[PDB]
Amino acid sequence: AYDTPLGITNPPIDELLSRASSKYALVIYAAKRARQINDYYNQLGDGILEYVGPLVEPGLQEKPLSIALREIHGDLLEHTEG
Template sequence: MSGTKAAPIGVTNPPIDDLLQHVDSKYALVIYSAKRARQINAYYAQLKEGLLEYVGPLVEAEASDKPLSIALQEINADKLVRTVGHDIPEVGTPGMPAEQPEAITPVTEEADEVAPAEDVDVMQDVEENTADAPENGTDES
């Protein structure tokens, strides 16, 4: 071997163990990163239309980087704020505002303000998708 080390980016960089320190479970990490990747993908799609509803990548990203890789790098760099709670009302609930509070919001570098993002409820999706999962995190097969 020539003595050079590969520097993979994406699922192996940042390492999974480092990413799991930012969430409660591997299921939460999957949903959390997937929702942020969708936001990043929507941001790139709306750039062509001239709209600026979504927040773009918060970490240094190349044009060839995939949205999921960017989302994982943002999670590892603590660039996102994740709100966990069951008290987020459904849209259209009587007596509640028409908009839900954001559950994943990018943090801007200006005076610790939080930039608006797409409405998401990570914990609700985690609970729905892990209802049948084994408690110890291993497959029963």
């Protein structure tokens, strides 16, 4: 085991890299999803779009980027690379 992660180090990058191609794809992967979540808490997505998530049970005041990372860790979303 790896004991337990504290804050930013959770979830581990290794368990997250299995969900995407490279560490870079992981970035855009969670980045755009964070933009999606924060739109949901606001009025999203203006015209013709409806925000989705949070798929996982959000923390107390968890940051949307921190939510998109847990969602990717649980395979709750799939992505396609261009």
